Design a protein around this motif. Structure first.
Motif, PDB file in Angstrom:
ATOM      1  N   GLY A 205       0.806  -1.231   0.000  1.00  7.63           N
ATOM      2  CA  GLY A 205       0.000   0.000   0.000  1.00  7.63           C
ATOM      3  C   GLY A 205       0.827   1.262   0.000  1.00  7.63           C
ATOM      4  O   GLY A 205       0.286   2.364   0.086  1.00  7.63           O
ATOM      5  N   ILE A 209      -0.194   0.923  -7.245  1.00 15.52           N
ATOM      6  CA  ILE A 209      -1.637   0.800  -7.296  1.00 15.52           C
ATOM      7  C   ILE A 209      -2.236   0.743  -5.885  1.00 15.52           C
ATOM      8  O   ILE A 209      -3.328   1.260  -5.643  1.00 15.52           O
ATOM      9  CB  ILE A 209      -2.094  -0.444  -8.089  1.00 15.52           C
ATOM     10  CG1 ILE A 209      -1.575  -0.410  -9.535  1.00 15.52           C
ATOM     11  CG2 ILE A 209      -3.625  -0.486  -8.128  1.00 15.52           C
ATOM     12  CD1 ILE A 209      -1.652  -1.770 -10.213  1.00 15.52           C
ATOM     13  N   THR A 229       1.234  -1.549   4.175  1.00 15.07           N
ATOM     14  CA  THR A 229       2.439  -2.347   4.403  1.00 15.07           C
ATOM     15  C   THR A 229       3.281  -2.526   3.133  1.00 15.07           C
ATOM     16  O   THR A 229       2.786  -2.455   2.002  1.00 15.07           O
ATOM     17  CB  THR A 229       2.178  -3.735   5.063  1.00 15.07           C
ATOM     18  OG1 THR A 229       1.802  -4.709   4.084  1.00 15.07           O
ATOM     19  CG2 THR A 229       1.088  -3.659   6.086  1.00 15.07           C
ATOM     20  N   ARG A 231       7.903  -3.469   2.346  1.00 14.11           N
ATOM     21  CA  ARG A 231       9.138  -4.072   2.829  1.00 14.11           C
ATOM     22  C   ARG A 231      10.017  -3.050   3.534  1.00 14.11           C
ATOM     23  O   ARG A 231      10.629  -3.372   4.539  1.00 14.11           O
ATOM     24  CB  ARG A 231       9.909  -4.710   1.670  1.00 14.11           C
ATOM     25  CG  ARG A 231       9.200  -5.928   1.061  1.00 14.11           C
ATOM     26  CD  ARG A 231       9.927  -6.434  -0.184  1.00 14.11           C
ATOM     27  NE  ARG A 231       9.927  -5.429  -1.254  1.00 14.11           N
ATOM     28  CZ  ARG A 231      10.469  -5.594  -2.462  1.00 14.11           C
ATOM     29  NH1 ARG A 231      11.042  -6.757  -2.812  1.00 14.11           N
ATOM     30  NH2 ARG A 231      10.410  -4.598  -3.347  1.00 14.11           N
ATOM     31  N   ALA A 301       0.731  -6.566  -2.316  1.00 14.74           N
ATOM     32  CA  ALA A 301       2.156  -6.898  -2.193  1.00 14.74           C
ATOM     33  C   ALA A 301       2.556  -7.834  -3.358  1.00 14.74           C
ATOM     34  O   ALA A 301       1.909  -8.838  -3.621  1.00 14.74           O
ATOM     35  CB  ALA A 301       2.431  -7.578  -0.871  1.00 14.74           C
ATOM     36  N   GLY A 302       3.581  -7.468  -4.090  1.00 15.72           N
ATOM     37  CA  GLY A 302       3.937  -8.261  -5.262  1.00 15.72           C
ATOM     38  C   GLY A 302       5.172  -7.734  -5.925  1.00 15.72           C
ATOM     39  O   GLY A 302       5.451  -6.523  -5.845  1.00 15.72           O
ATOM     40  N   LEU A 303       5.900  -8.662  -6.557  1.00 13.70           N
ATOM     41  CA  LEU A 303       7.081  -8.405  -7.363  1.00 13.70           C
ATOM     42  C   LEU A 303       6.940  -9.122  -8.714  1.00 13.70           C
ATOM     43  O   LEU A 303       6.434 -10.255  -8.778  1.00 13.70           O
ATOM     44  CB  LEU A 303       8.315  -9.085  -6.752  1.00 13.70           C
ATOM     45  CG  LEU A 303       9.054  -8.671  -5.486  1.00 13.70           C
ATOM     46  CD1 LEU A 303       8.564  -9.453  -4.282  1.00 13.70           C
ATOM     47  CD2 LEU A 303      10.548  -8.912  -5.669  1.00 13.70           C
ATOM     48  N   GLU A 324       6.706 -15.495  -2.811  1.00 14.67           N
ATOM     49  CA  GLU A 324       6.566 -15.229  -1.366  1.00 14.67           C
ATOM     50  C   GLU A 324       5.373 -14.318  -0.981  1.00 14.67           C
ATOM     51  O   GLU A 324       4.560 -14.720  -0.140  1.00 14.67           O
ATOM     52  CB  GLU A 324       7.896 -14.754  -0.748  1.00 14.67           C
ATOM     53  CG  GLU A 324       7.877 -14.498   0.778  1.00 14.67           C
ATOM     54  CD  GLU A 324       7.448 -13.076   1.175  1.00 14.67           C
ATOM     55  OE1 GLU A 324       7.586 -12.153   0.359  1.00 14.67           O
ATOM     56  OE2 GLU A 324       6.981 -12.874   2.307  1.00 14.67           O
ATOM     57  N   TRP A 390      -5.943  -8.431 -12.983  1.00 13.19           N
ATOM     58  CA  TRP A 390      -5.828  -7.111 -13.592  1.00 13.19           C
ATOM     59  C   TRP A 390      -5.041  -7.145 -14.919  1.00 13.19           C
ATOM     60  O   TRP A 390      -4.022  -7.833 -15.020  1.00 13.19           O
ATOM     61  CB  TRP A 390      -5.114  -6.137 -12.676  1.00 13.19           C
ATOM     62  CG  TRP A 390      -5.863  -5.769 -11.477  1.00 13.19           C
ATOM     63  CD1 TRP A 390      -5.625  -6.202 -10.215  1.00 13.19           C
ATOM     64  CD2 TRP A 390      -6.986  -4.875 -11.400  1.00 13.19           C
ATOM     65  NE1 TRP A 390      -6.530  -5.632  -9.341  1.00 13.19           N
ATOM     66  CE2 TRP A 390      -7.377  -4.817 -10.042  1.00 13.19           C
ATOM     67  CE3 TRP A 390      -7.705  -4.145 -12.339  1.00 13.19           C
ATOM     68  CZ2 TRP A 390      -8.449  -4.055  -9.602  1.00 13.19           C
ATOM     69  CZ3 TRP A 390      -8.780  -3.360 -11.904  1.00 13.19           C
ATOM     70  CH2 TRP A 390      -9.146  -3.332 -10.540  1.00 13.19           C
ATOM     71  N   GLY A 397       2.014   2.307 -10.786  1.00 12.78           N
ATOM     72  CA  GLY A 397       2.600   0.994 -10.474  1.00 12.78           C
ATOM     73  C   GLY A 397       3.808   0.685 -11.348  1.00 12.78           C
ATOM     74  O   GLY A 397       4.511   1.604 -11.798  1.00 12.78           O
ATOM     75  N   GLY A 399       3.894   0.162 -14.312  1.00 11.09           N
ATOM     76  CA  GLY A 399       3.785   0.998 -15.515  1.00 11.09           C
ATOM     77  C   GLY A 399       3.279   0.135 -16.647  1.00 11.09           C
ATOM     78  O   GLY A 399       2.520  -0.802 -16.397  1.00 11.09           O
TER      79      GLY A 399
HETATM   80  N1  LIG Z   1       1.178  -2.463 -12.453  1.00  9.70           N
HETATM   81  C1  LIG Z   1       0.357  -3.266 -13.130  1.00  9.70           C
HETATM   82  O1  LIG Z   1       0.034  -2.991 -14.278  1.00  9.70           O
HETATM   83  C2  LIG Z   1      -0.208  -4.536 -12.549  1.00  9.70           C
HETATM   84  C3  LIG Z   1      -0.030  -4.895 -11.214  1.00  9.70           C
HETATM   85  N2  LIG Z   1      -0.537  -6.031 -10.708  1.00  9.70           N
HETATM   86  C4  LIG Z   1      -0.321  -6.366  -9.294  1.00  9.70           C
HETATM   87  O2  LIG Z   1      -0.723  -5.255  -8.485  1.00  9.70           O
HETATM   88  C5  LIG Z   1       0.098  -5.176  -7.325  1.00  9.70           C
HETATM   89  C6  LIG Z   1       0.704  -3.795  -7.220  1.00  9.70           C
HETATM   90  O3  LIG Z   1       1.339  -3.503  -8.458  1.00  9.70           O
HETATM   91  P1  LIG Z   1       2.274  -2.233  -8.627  1.00  9.70           P
HETATM   92  O4  LIG Z   1       1.569  -1.064  -7.990  1.00  9.70           O
HETATM   93  O5  LIG Z   1       2.694  -2.194 -10.070  1.00  9.70           O
HETATM   94  O6  LIG Z   1       3.519  -2.595  -7.703  1.00  9.70           O
HETATM   95  P2  LIG Z   1       4.699  -1.596  -7.262  1.00  9.70           P
HETATM   96  O7  LIG Z   1       6.019  -2.263  -7.508  1.00  9.70           O
HETATM   97  O8  LIG Z   1       4.445  -0.195  -7.752  1.00  9.70           O
HETATM   98  O9  LIG Z   1       4.463  -1.660  -5.685  1.00  9.70           O
HETATM   99  C7  LIG Z   1       4.756  -2.869  -5.003  1.00  9.70           C
HETATM  100  C8  LIG Z   1       4.296  -2.691  -3.583  1.00  9.70           C
HETATM  101  O10 LIG Z   1       4.308  -3.954  -2.927  1.00  9.70           O
HETATM  102  C9  LIG Z   1       5.312  -3.938  -1.919  1.00  9.70           C
HETATM  103  N3  LIG Z   1       6.006  -5.236  -1.945  1.00  9.70           N
HETATM  104  C10 LIG Z   1       6.706  -5.762  -2.968  1.00  9.70           C
HETATM  105  N4  LIG Z   1       7.174  -6.990  -2.630  1.00  9.70           N
HETATM  106  C11 LIG Z   1       6.764  -7.250  -1.371  1.00  9.70           C
HETATM  107  C12 LIG Z   1       6.900  -8.353  -0.401  1.00  9.70           C
HETATM  108  N5  LIG Z   1       7.601  -9.469  -0.708  1.00  9.70           N
HETATM  109  N6  LIG Z   1       6.306  -8.220   0.809  1.00  9.70           N
HETATM  110  C13 LIG Z   1       5.600  -7.122   1.151  1.00  9.70           C
HETATM  111  N7  LIG Z   1       5.440  -6.074   0.321  1.00  9.70           N
HETATM  112  C14 LIG Z   1       5.980  -6.087  -0.928  1.00  9.70           C
HETATM  113  C15 LIG Z   1       6.211  -2.750  -2.188  1.00  9.70           C
HETATM  114  O11 LIG Z   1       6.817  -2.310  -0.971  1.00  9.70           O
HETATM  115  P3  LIG Z   1       8.269  -1.612  -0.960  1.00  9.70           P
HETATM  116  O12 LIG Z   1       8.005  -0.319  -1.676  1.00  9.70           O
HETATM  117  O13 LIG Z   1       8.618  -1.520   0.497  1.00  9.70           O
HETATM  118  O14 LIG Z   1       9.153  -2.566  -1.726  1.00  9.70           O
HETATM  119  C16 LIG Z   1       5.207  -1.790  -2.784  1.00  9.70           C
HETATM  120  O15 LIG Z   1       4.414  -1.160  -1.773  1.00  9.70           O
HETATM  121  C17 LIG Z   1       1.170  -6.256  -7.465  1.00  9.70           C
HETATM  122  O16 LIG Z   1       0.813  -7.363  -6.635  1.00  9.70           O
HETATM  123  C18 LIG Z   1       1.134  -6.640  -8.931  1.00  9.70           C
HETATM  124  O17 LIG Z   1       1.506  -8.006  -9.161  1.00  9.70           O
HETATM  125  C19 LIG Z   1      -1.254  -6.862 -11.468  1.00  9.70           C
HETATM  126  C20 LIG Z   1      -1.508  -6.616 -12.812  1.00  9.70           C
HETATM  127  C21 LIG Z   1      -1.010  -5.422 -13.476  1.00  9.70           C
END
Ligand SMILES: NC(=O)C1=CN([C@@H]2O[C@H](COP(=O)(O)OP(=O)(O)OC[C@H]3O[C@@H](n4cnc5c(N)ncnc54)[C@H](OP(=O)(O)O)[C@@H]3O)[C@@H](O)[C@H]2O)C=CC1
Length: 452
Positions: A205, A209, A229, A231, A301-303, A324, A390, A397, A399
């Motif tokens: 968050g 996104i 939340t 990292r 949360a996602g990478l 993870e 999505w 995000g 991008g």
């Molecule tokens: N952007 C897109 O077009 C799309 C996105 N999604 C999904 O939407 C979600 C958000 O996407 P997006 O905004 O692009 O992501 P961003 O990379 O912009 O943001 C990722 C966020 O998740 C946190 N995060 C990453 N890895 C971990 C982890 N292992 N544990 C806890 N927190 C974590 C980051 O925290 P920190 O900043 O501390 O690293 C950050 O707040 C993702 O799950 C992605 O898979 C799905 C389809 C399309």
């Protein structure tokens, strides 16, 4: 951006036309639990290798017709990734003129199944897509019925394996074969007030996104308490004034907390290892003690792994890092919030979970997001949980940098406003536990061919 639709996975009859056997070795991947099944399957393959992963690779891989994976018919430990290297080696080193990969699960699909058996979810997503990354492969996920006897199942497996099909995903229900496809949700292709003393929890968050969702819920749903939340551990609040002119991601986070707090919202931005049971418990107790009960969850949360694209070049460790937050992290979070008074629990999955052509070059991300899809289907009875597949978000995000397959898919990249309206509808309605919201240029859109 022309036309909104909501797609869900549906099934239609896809009979096999011919099942011609070969005589090259077929590998059979199993574990202790699925070894009896594996033995029964083995009687249909005179030439086979039983690979029990709970018992390295000096194999003449070019002599193989393929591999049958039945680990998904047992428990299938999501944290044990050893099986992966057997698939990678066969894919890389096997004959380039055709080889077959078949993953079998039992009761994983919700079609004609009132009880999803949550085993094989991440692995199904891999096998669904490998034939789009490697042109020489035939790769398939098959879901049998839970009731199916081992002898009957072995027969179905053998016929499937040697079939004339290139279907990515199939199931068997009452002896009949069905193939999966995407279609505009059946009928719907209001909202209650979020309680002011409850907390909206958003993992991931802190930017992208998820942060956009945070601003949106504070503005349009009157949310008064946000826990965001990620990292990174922010420094103590007393340090924050030194970041006013900084252009760093950390500076932006601090600024975002301040903008939310200006709307009259209590905001905490926390570092949380989501797969750490002790930390999640402790953090959730802190929230409940000091802020209030959890009224909603958004799991962003996602990478993506943007360095190593080829499946066969990924290590276990690389893959584990991508899984993870979405697999172990989701499961652990769920265990600690499932009894809260949740209005929604929204999972941010991806079109790459389910459209094989888009999965290519990011197989671990497809596995991760696929797990969330099935997780929502398996837990829909216990929680208001929805996995959203999505498309690409154009304006925030990760991008865009979208590729030819994405453009060729006819999917459009969506604006923030499109995405938030999609989210609001998904929460307000019953699209069911898994939905793919898309903006499409209607003239040039065949959703029913997306999975072929
Ligand atoms: N952007 C897109 O077009 C799309 C996105 N999604 C999904 O939407 C979600 C958000 O996407 P997006 O905004 O692009 O992501 P961003 O990379 O912009 O943001 C990722 C966020 O998740 C946190 N995060 C990453 N890895 C971990 C982890 N292992 N544990 C806890 N927190 C974590 C980051 O925290 P920190 O900043 O501390 O690293 C950050 O707040 C993702 O799950 C992605 O898979 C799905 C389809 C399309």
């Amino acid at each position: 951006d022309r036309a909104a639709c909501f797609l869900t996975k549906q099934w239609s009859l896809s009979p096999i036309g011919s099942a011609v056997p070969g005589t090259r070795t077929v590998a059979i991947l199993c574990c202790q639990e699925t070894a009896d099944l594996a033995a029964e399957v083995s009687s249909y393959f005179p030439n086979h290798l039983l690979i029990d992963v709970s018992r390295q690779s000096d194999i003449d891989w070019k002599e193989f017709d393929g591999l049958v994976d039945v680990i998904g018919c047992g428990w299938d430990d999501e944290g044990r990734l050893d099986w992966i290297e057997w698939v990678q080696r066969l894919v890389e080193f096997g004959h380039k003129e055709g080889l077959r990969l078949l993953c079998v699960t039992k009761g994983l699909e919700s079609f004609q199944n009132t009880s999803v058996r949550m085993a094989g979810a991440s692995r199904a997503g891999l096998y669904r897509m490998l034939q789009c990354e490697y042109s020489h492969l035939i790769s398939r996920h098959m879901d049998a019925e839970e009731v199916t006897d081992h002898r009957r199942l072995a027969k179905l497996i053998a016929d499937e394996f040697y079939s004339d099909s290139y279907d990515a995903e199939v199931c068997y229900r009452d002896g009949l074969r069905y193939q999966a496809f995407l279609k505009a949700h059946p009928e719907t292709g209001q909202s209650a007030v979020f309680p002011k003393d409850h907390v909206l929890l958003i993992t991931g968050g802190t930017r992208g996104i998820g942060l956009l969702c945070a601003r949106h819920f504070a503005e349009c749903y009157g949310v008064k308490k946000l826990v965001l939340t990620g990292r990174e551990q922010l420094p103590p609040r007393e340090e924050w004034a030194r970041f006013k002119t900084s252009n760093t991601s950390l500076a932006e986070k601090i600024q975002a907390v301040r903008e939310l707090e200006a709307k009259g919202v209590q905001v905490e931005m926390l570092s949380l290892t989501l797969s750490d049971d002790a930390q999640v418990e402790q953090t959730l107790q802190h929230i409940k003690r000091t802020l209030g009960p959890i009224g909603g969850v958004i799991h962003c949360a996602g990478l993506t792994d943007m360095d190593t694209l080829a499946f066969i070049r990924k290590t276990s460790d690389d893959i584990q890092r991508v899984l993870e937050p979405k697999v172990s992290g989701l499961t652990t979070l769920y265990r600690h919030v499932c009894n809260e008074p949740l209005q929604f629990f929204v999972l941010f999955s991806s079109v790459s979970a389910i459209i094989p052509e888009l999965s290519a070059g990011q197989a671990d991300y497809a596995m991760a997001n696929s797990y969330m899809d099935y997780f929502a289907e398996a837990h829909q009875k216990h929680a208001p949980i929805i996995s959203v597949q999505w498309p690409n978000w154009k304006e925030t995000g990760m991008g865009e940098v979208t590729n030819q397959a994405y453009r060729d898919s006819g999917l459009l990249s969506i604006t923030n406003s499109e995405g938030l309206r999609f989210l609001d509808q998904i929460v307000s309605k019953k699209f069911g536990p898994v939905v793919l919201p898309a903006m499409a240029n209607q003239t040039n859109w065949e959703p029913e061919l997306l999975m072929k």
